[model samples]
Every structure is written in C-alpha cells, then in structure tokens.
Target: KDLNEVIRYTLWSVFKLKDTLPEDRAGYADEVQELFDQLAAKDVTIRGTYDLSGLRADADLMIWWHAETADQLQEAYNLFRRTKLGRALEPVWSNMALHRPPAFLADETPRNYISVYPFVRSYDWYLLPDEDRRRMLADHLKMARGYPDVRANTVASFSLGDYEWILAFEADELHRIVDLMRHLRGSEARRHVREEIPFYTGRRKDIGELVAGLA
Candidate 1:
C-alpha cells in the first residue's frame, strides 16, 4: 500500500455555499460530521476538510479525499449531498490526482495548520537525465527534510490539471512551511519551475465547526 502502484485516487473539492438550510443547523452539523466519518471508514481512506471561507475569495470549504477509486469518492459525496447541509451547497472547483512513485505521503490527518499547494511545472523538467532529476528531487527533498521538527505532514501526487501536481503540508506554524519553501528557491529544480500560485493556508476544522461559522 505504500507504493505508487497502490495508487490512491486523490480528490480536492471546493464548495461555495449559497446558504445553509438555516433551520436545520444543528442537524446538518451532526449529519455532516457523520458523513465525514462514514467516508473514511467505508472507503478505508484518509480525508480532511479545510475551512476556506474567509481565507480565499474562491470558495467557502475545501474537502480533500484520498481513496482507491473514483466511485468511492462519488459514493461518499452522494451520501453527503443527500444530507440537509449538503443539499444547500454547490461545488466550485474540483481536482484530482494519483499517488505517484516519488511522492512522500505522510499521515494526512489534518492539523490546525495545513496548506493545499497546487503548482505547475515546465517542460524542461522532463528533459533532464535520471541523475539530474534525482539530485534535483534530492535537493527538493532535503529542503523538506531540513524541517524535521516542523511537525508537518505533506503529501504529493501526479495530477491531471494545468498543474502537473499538487501538495499539501501540515505544520504547527505557517512560517515553518515558509522556511522549507524558502530553502527550495535556489535548488536546481527551480530551473524547471513554472508557476506555484495561491498557496492555500488554513486550519482544519470539524465539518460542524466549519459550518457553524458560515454566513
């Protein structure tokens, strides 16, 4: 299961609410948490929900899922949408990926601080020789390694979007992640860089807590 061939299909879903079903607030909260647990248990996968309401203009909530198949994810959200809270929401953006061979997947159990990093790579990345790629990745990995005490869990995978991949890092302090990225700025991998934008930074909250703060 640790290998890339095990291939967990990862999904990043963004939701923007028109509104919550006001009267059923408490009910919705309870059902939503139950839905969260049900998916993790039934699908036997890791998942987390990040609150994006005030942090980004793009959406109010981001639910991240890692499972073995697309159907599992669909079934999970199907059960979600059937709930009172889910019935009132809409998805704005959704992206997916597969756990790749080189990825360093840690416990995705969300911390109070975690970041959803979506990035793009240039064609030059592929032109490199195996040795070159290894070192570049080594340096990149070293940058991450420098933060051993940072208490962050970062998972990376091969994506199908404009960005070739995406990564998420969880740490106690936002700057701890910043320090890691800062170290990477000079790595040879920078030669093949394209774009890394809107580095999403927010705390993980229970679905109930995330919803309760909603307007």
Candidate 2:
C-alpha cells in the first residue's frame, strides 16, 4: 500500500529542451515559474530540478517530484504541458515510482551529489529463503557502511517491468559512491542484477535556480 500518510509517490524524469523564439522566452519561462510557485505555496509537494545541459545529449534537464496522489503530480505536468515551451520540448526519459524507506539505514541529511539509476534482478534472486535474503541484504547494507559520505534512497514500481526499481544516492565525494558501487559488485547480490544504466548524476537545486536556468 502507498498508504504511508499524505506522501507516497516520487517521479523522476528528463527533458530535452528545444530552441525557442525570442518573443516566447519570457512567457515560456513565466508559465514554469508560476506552476512551481503555486506548488511551493501549497506546501503539499516536494520538488527539485536538475540541470543536465552539458553532461548528456539525451536530456537538458531533470525534475524530481514527490506527492500523495498521481493526479496531483500529473496535474502539475498537464498545467505545464499546455504552455508553449512544453509543446516545443521533448521528454527523453521518465519513471514513476513509490517512495520506499532506506533498505539499509535511513539518512535524511542532504549531500552534494545525487545519483539515480533504474535496477532489476534475476528471478531466482527472489526465490531465495527468507534467511538467505536477509543475510545477503545485511551484507549489502554493511558494505555501504564503509562509505559514510553517501546517503541512500530507493523507489519501487512493482507493476511494470520497465526497470521496476530505482536506487538513488547522495554523497559529498563522487569517489565514495564509486567505491561503494565497486564493493557491491563483489557481493552475492551482484550476481542477480540484470541492468542498471543511464545514471543521472547532479546536485539538487532549489526551484528558483531551476526556473532561472530556463530563463
């Protein structure tokens, strides 16, 4: 059940920005600013934007949003979709998932780096005995303890197989994440992995800078 309270879902998606006319720039920017301003005012949703302009060709920006209802999230998207800029742009990638507690230890504090990737596991991985699963995950969790700089979060999408789960991490040192990932690969859990790719790496930014980036 996504019935954990008023908050339940998180959406992470990428957008490829397109060229626009000089005349439509301000209006395009205005619509987005307004959409976010209302969301901020209501204080019912948590949202952040990431700039992927120079790092990758697939998308120019990424947005992360959290809310209780999918409708609330889609409402915001549809509001923007009606805008001129939304019409001009293309959605390069997107994923919808339910918020999940940290499988290891929970770290609520913020960090400098935010990395997200879709993950999958082999069928046999789930068939393991309960004790076996616990031991394997315990070891997986222990490996991460070696790197104190990184905090982790996970999202689940059990209904669809288009990359059912997403693992996100935050850290002050990129190398910490690199080492942590390398360590995980040596564990038994690594053998069940199918794929995890197109990692999105960037720092979290306030809504103000995100809107300004568009302007």
Candidate 3:
C-alpha cells in the first residue's frame, strides 16, 4: 500500500497571546468560535481549544486537515489562506509549527507533562518491498498494543499538501512512553529504518487538568 495515499495530513501549531484583549474576552471567545465554525464548514477538522485555560490568551493545537492528495490540499489551503477571517486573525497568533504524525497519546488527572513533535521516517522507507513493510508494521503494532496505557492517534496526510503524518499522544506516565520509543527503535522490525533526530518534548500546563477532566 502506498503510505502517502493511506493518511490524512494536518498542520499543527500552538498559539501564544500577543497582547491583552478587551475585558470582554468572552466576546473574543465567540469570535473564535465563529472562526472555528467557518473552518468546520470548509471541511477542516478542528479541536477549538485543546485544553488551554487560564494560562494565556493563546491556545494550543490549532490544526487543519484535508483528504490525502496534492491538488485538493492546495485548493483548500489556497482558499483558506486568502480568506478575510484567516488574514484578520493572523496577528493574534504568536508561535506556530507544522507537524505530521506517527503519534501516541495518554491522559491522566492533569499534571505537568505534554509533548509535541514532527516525526519523519527515512526517505528510503517507501522503497522497501510491500510485504516487508507490512511485516515490519505488524511487529510495530504488536509492541504498541502491549501498552494499553498509551494511546496513539495517527493521521495520514500524504500528497494532500502538508506533512506526511500527524500524531498526538496524551499520557500520565511520560517515562513509560519513552521506554516504548526505545523499544520501537531497537526492535528488529525497525532495524532498517532511520530514526529522525531531534523530536520535540515539552512540559504542558494550563490544559493538563482540563484534558484529564475531559477524558
């Protein structure tokens, strides 16, 4: 199977408040919700606020997605990029990053750790024979399934105009996940794959408890 054709692609970013808004933050919240509504109509999958509360004016994980294909993705983004709404809200956002996935997730009563990153496999990964790739993936899945404590949310977006994958994981025990990563890397199935260096890791706050509660 072509990996590119198998997944929906997404753009992920964390936003920070640039300035103090009017005391009527509630009004601003309405505006934000309206924007999200428009995005939804356009077939954009959004998670309005991923647990951001009381920390800052900005929110976390503003994501955009499209069915896996180049022409369709470009069309969607071109329209989005030119929208008056997109232009108007551009400045309110501070930091942004794009991501693709092979992601994992776990959640607990809000604590202190949250991580995000862009994950890329070796370019040669697709060159392997299909059967070999499938067997390797089977092994990979077995390892992942053993950890019911960990949750993996994998999104595929190949050729649809953005990253190849977008993954997210929420878990209480960060170290267990770390060990999982190590096992995956060292596994016989992964022996031929090149692990990309410098993945992202961060401590998440504000929404931690909120996400836990939502869970």
Candidate 4:
C-alpha cells in the first residue's frame, strides 16, 4: 500500500527552548516526559522527534507528526502548548501539508540527520503544459535517484500551508544531502523554483535525550 493512502496529513514543528522553566530539574524533566506521554495517546502519530540543539540557534527541537486529519494535528499541538516544557518553549516555525505520494518513498529506517524545508514553484511553472512539467520533473527525479542512500519525501502544501510543498530528506552523511541538492540545482525543474528557504537540519534523538539537551 502507498503512503498516500496511509497518511493524510503531515506536520513539521520547530521550537526554541526558553528560560522560563521551573527551578526544579526533576519536575521539569517529568513535565517534558508528560508531553510525550500525552502525545502518544493522541490521534496523531509521531514520526520523528529531533534535537536541533547545536544545529540551529533559533530552533532547539523539531517534531514530525502525521495523522489522518488536520483536526488531529490541531489537537496534538493544542495539547503540546499546554505542557510545562511547552509553555516555556517557543515555536519558531511550523508547517502543515497534505501527504502526497512522492515520486519515490524511501525506506522509513532511521537516519542520523534529516533536512526539511518548504518548496515553492513559480506561477509560470504551473502555467506550463502538463507534459512539459512532467518532463522537467522526470529530470528532477533522475538527479534524486543518483543518491539512493538519502531518503526523500515530499508533502503537498497546496492550500494547507504557505508553500507548494515540503521537502524532507534523511541521510547518515550530511554531505550526500548537500551534493544531491547541488545535482538537482542544475536540473530543468530547478529553473521553475521560486523559493526553498529556512531549511532545518536536525539530529534524531530519543525524547529524553532531546529534553536533556534543552537549557
């Protein structure tokens, strides 16, 4: 079965840990764990929780959550914002999109690091004939195939978020991800891109590890 049929919505949330935490370290840790515990029972599923501690100054953590409906996403985040750690943490960036079957679905096996960003195509690109766009996309896929080890998935933003799509790539070596993008940069489809910014790269870690990294 394809993931397009499996998952309906995807959410990417980035938060910066703030200094408003309680003085009790033990209680603080328990509060953090409580949030994860609550999330596990929510309608949404946690795909990945990453530690962005040393990766980005503005973002201390990132969570990739997917569910069958946007309502579930909202409820999960709603619950998140009420937790102790969540009260002190500030959300820097959050994006939601409809899950679209990618040209290829990479293995779900864990990777050391994952890079995510919003992707937008030019208005003119949409005006082009379907066949022409397909040819250009084929070129894009060709470049991606060169780096098989780098897992990739694209979720359609359509009307759900700010950009046209959200691109996520997971890999063990960061250089391979960069090199793959460099190759795609020369592809025919790259010319149609209007924007792809505010990229986030995070290291996958356990919930406890992520909580410990905060502050």
Candidate 5:
C-alpha cells in the first residue's frame, strides 16, 4: 500500500565534545562506543556516521539519519541526550530536511568522504518561468553527469533550517569534489544560488573511533 516513490526525513547533526566529559577517558570512550552500538542496532534510521574531528574546528562527530517518520529522528535525539557521553555532547550544527528518492541520493555503500553544506536559492529564481527554470536545471544536470563516481544528494530544508536546501556529496577523494564544483560554477543554475558555503567535510568512520578521538 505504498507509492512508487518514498519520502524520507533526513537529519544531519554535528556535535562537539565538552570539557565536562568524564576524566575516565578509556571508560568514557567505551561508553560512547556502546551507546552508538546500541543505537545502530536499535534504530534503522541511523544511516551514516562520520568523523570530522581534524577537518573542522567547530564540530567533532557528525551523524546522518533518515527516517520514514520525524518521530523516529526525535527519538534518536532523545536517546543521545540521555546518555553519559551524550550529556557532554554539544550540538554545534544540525539540519533537518526531507529526502525524496532519486533526487541527489547516492548508492547504498557510503563513500570515503562526504561534504555537506546548506544551499539557498535566490527569491527571483522562483519567479522565472518553468521553462526557463528547466533549461537552467538541464545545464546543471549536464555538468553533473560528467562525474559518475561522485554521488550527490539534495535534501529539502525549506522551513526546517536557515537554508532552503542541504546538499551532500560523497566521493572517493576530495579532489574529485573540487573538480566537480569547478565545472558546476559555469552552469546556468549557478547564478540562482544565493548562498552556499561553510562546507563540513567528514571522513566515514566507526562511531566509536570518532568518539574516541574526542577523549
């Protein structure tokens, strides 16, 4: 009794460790590992987890989740807040969006690196005729087609966050992303992009490993 396409509620959260973390570094790391293990098994919403400790100053651990229902996401957040390490975790950045399948979603296996950022379109872009909008999008899509290995996903965050959309690009190497973007800059649709910056790049890693780095 379902439609051909499914809509998933996506969540991207970045957390920073606090000085309040217990002095028992070893024990705390184990606890953090256990917490994530329990979460991975307990909930299917947990999609991806990445370590951003060395890459970003403001964030340490980033978790990506997609659920059929928003309640599932809230439940995951609740569970995190109730744990010991979770108590010491501070949410530095978070984005909530709706993911419609085949619209920037990548393959099943997570890539080596993921770069996530917010995207805002200009107000006037919406005023353009549908034909004009389609033409510009076609140009963008054409440029995107050159890079087959790089998987890009766009999630809608219209009223969920400060930005209108959240874009995540997964690739085997960082240089591929840079090259891809360099080509996209010439797309017609690029002109409509009002804001897109403060990118957060994360390397895929076990949740325990990521949490351990905090200690």
Candidate 6:
C-alpha cells in the first residue's frame, strides 16, 4: 500500500542556552542567525526565541518532511549534524526530546494566544484499518471545522530522524481553547486512545507582550 511505503516526519532540536541576549553575550545572536540562514536552505521551518515566560531560553530548530522509510530519516539526521554550523554549536544544547502527534484534534482562534503540545497516540491507533481511521478522522475534523477561529499547523516527523511531530496552533482566545480540550476529552474519539507522556501548554502572549504585539 502507498501508506506503507511512506513515512512523514518532523525534525526538531531545542537549545537551552546559558545566556539569551546577544547584547549580553556579544556575537551569539549573529552566530545563531547565521546558522539559521544556513539551515533555511534545507527545507526546514525555523523559529527562535529569548527566554519568554513558559518556554525554554534556548531556540528550537525544526523541520517537516516526508521520506520513504525510517532508515532514510537516519541518513538525513547524520547529514544535518555534520553541517558546519551544526557541529560548531553542538556543545550548547541541553535537554532535547522528540515527539509524535496523537490522533487528537487541534484548531486556532483569533484570541491572540498560541499553545503547543507534544502528543503520543495509543498503540491501538496503529492497529485500526484504514477505513476505521478515516471514519474517526472525519469525526475529529467535523468538530475542528466547527471552530473557524482556530488555525492549526502540524508537522509530521516520523522520518526526520528525530521527533515524531511538531504541532503548532495560534489563536487569541484562551477560554475557547479550554472548552475545546474539554469537548475533545468527552467526544467519542477519546474513548479509543490514550494521550501519553510529558506535554507543554502556554499562552503566546506571556512570552513577551511586545513580541505578541509584533505578531
């Protein structure tokens, strides 16, 4: 089957830096920016940050792509780490965790807040037949579509030789997000799977009101 021959993956690495500001550290920002410019050419999605509340001080580098197999993913990682910029900055990265998205739904609202989470699907999810998978996804999408205010972007990373998923949602409303979570937990889809491991959730506004303002 076509699905059996292809794997989707998202690659991400978090750098928990000891110092954040370039002004304070001198030349660090320029170095990181130079690295970003190099990686940008390689089909990667990148975002950087300086210790905003609710997030690590270190910047995160992420990429989304599709590959033929897990072995292909490993090859990609090897090349990525060998890049001149990658090798130069290897010593600064602190803790790193890779993740995969679950079968759960995500949506965005205009309320000026963004939340992200790392999710894992239950083992049973992989056992279901394609038809069953489609049916369940249809139901999930139906609910997500009902909330036009929410925008969701998901990166599949089963092959990036790293994390399983990089999921991002942007919205202005916090209460609506809370409600959406509640609704999903009560929905029929929740019955068939379990959400596993560590998950992080926070408002984008808290990062820096000015940064959110710029957005």
- RMSD in order of candidates: 3.0, 3.7, 7.8, 2.5, 2.8, 7.6
Q: What is the lDDT of candidate 5?
A: 0.77
The models' CA-based lDDT, in order, is: 0.70, 0.69, 0.45, 0.80, 0.77, 0.43
After superposing candidate 5, which stretches have Cα over 4 Å from the reference? 1-4, 20-24, 27-43, 101-106
State which candidate, 1 or 2, has the greater TM-score: 1
On TM-score, the stronger of 4 and 5 is 4
Over the stretch 1-215, how does candidate 5's per-residue lDDT look in tens digits? 24326767888888887754565555655665665667667553566778777677777778887767777777887777677767788888888888643333335776888889999998998899999998998888988898988888877788887998899888988889889989998988877888997688888776656556665
In model 1, pairs of residues that clash are none
Model 4, runs deviating above 4 Å: 1-3, 20-24, 27-34, 41-43, 101-107
Clashing pairs in 5: 104-153
Candidate 3's residue-wise lDDT over 32-57, tens digit each? 44545675676554432343334333
Deviation in Å, model 5, residue 201 alpha carbon: 0.6
TM-score, per-candidate, Cα-based: 0.83, 0.80, 0.51, 0.88, 0.86, 0.52
Top candidate on lDDT is 4
Q: Let me know the TM-score candidate 3 reaches against the reference structure.
A: 0.51
Q: After superposing candidate 1, which stretches have Cα over 4 Å from the reference?
A: 19-24, 44-46, 102-110, 149-159
lDDT of 2 by residue, 65-172 (tens): 656666777776666667766676688777777754442223345466667888888887788888888998898888778877777777787773388697777787
Once model 2 is optimally superposed onto the true structure by TM-score, how far is the C-alpha of residue 170 displaced, in angstroms?
1.9
True-vs-predicted CA distance for residue 200, candidate 5, Å:
1.0
**lDDT digits (tens) for residues 1-215 of candidate 6:** 33323333433333222332233333433454454455556533233232223443333322222233444444555554554333433332221223332211221122355445545556787788988878887888777765656566555544432344456555557666666666666556676654422333344332233222221
Candidate 2 wrong stretches, greater than 4 Å? 1-7, 19-30, 41-44, 100-110, 207-215
Q: Could you tally the backbone clashes for each prediction?
A: 0, 0, 20, 0, 1, 17
The TM-score that candidate 1 achieves is 0.83
Weakest lDDT window of 10 consecutive positions for candidate 1: 101-110
Candidate with best TM-score: 4
Cα deviation of 159, candidate 3, in Å: 3.9
